[PDB]
Amino acid sequence: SMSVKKPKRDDSKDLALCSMILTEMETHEDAWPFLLPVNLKLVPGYKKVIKKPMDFSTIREKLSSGQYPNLETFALDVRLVFDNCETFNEDDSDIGRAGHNMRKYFEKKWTDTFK
Ligand SMILES: Cn1cc(C(=O)NCCN)ccc1=O
């Protein structure tokens, strides 16, 4: 509360660590469904069904222009990519399985980096 300061973690490296985590995502071989925004004019149903589209390049742009206030909002956009994926794809499709793989890949790097 007011004048009651909780001891807080060092966040000076958060930007560089999130950038390196995103780089590992972008270079993962299963990252192809998520590198670029879903083409709303070439895919039937996505614009209406998916109310918050998100992809790695948009996350990269928001990270490179100071649009994430903290690292929690960064992980929100990353998880939004895979939440959208589950909403729109079957689990045993190539894209649906890539999302599950990429999500598990992310959450371990998130724990190994900040926890
Ligand atoms: C990540 N993601 C990719 C597609 C896509 O590109 N579909 C083309 C079908 N061959 C659709 C939904 C989704 O969430």
Curated annotation (Swiss-Prot):
Domain of life where this protein originates: Eukaryota
User: What does the record say about tissue specificity?
Assistant: Expressed at varying levels in several tissues, whereas a smaller transcript was expressed specifically in testis.
Location of this chain's protein in the cell: Nucleus
Q: What is this protein called?
A: Bromodomain adjacent to zinc finger domain protein 2B
General function of this protein: Regulatory subunit of the ATP-dependent BRF-1 and BRF-5 ISWI chromatin remodeling complexes, which form ordered nucleosome arrays on chromatin and facilitate access to DNA during DNA-templated processes such as DNA replication, transcription, and repair. Both complexes regulate the spacing of nucleosomes along the chromatin and have the ability to slide mononucleosomes to the center of a DNA template. The BRF-1 ISWI chromatin remodeling complex has a lower ATP hydrolysis rate than the BRF-5 ISWI chromatin remodeling complex.
Bromo domain location is 9-113
The UniProt family comment states: Belongs to the WAL family.
Give the organism the record lists: Homo sapiens (Human)
- The protein's gene is named BAZ2B
Relate the assembly described in the record.
Answer: Component of the BRF-1 ISWI chromatin remodeling complex, at least composed of SMARCA1 and BAZ2B, which regulates the spacing of histone octamers on the DNA template to facilitate access to DNA. Within the BRF-1 ISWI chromatin remodeling complex interacts with SMARCA1; the interaction is direct. Component of the BRF-5 ISWI chromatin remodeling complex, at least composed of SMARCA5/SNF2H and BAZ2B, which regulates the spacing of histone octamers on the DNA template to facilitate access to DNA.
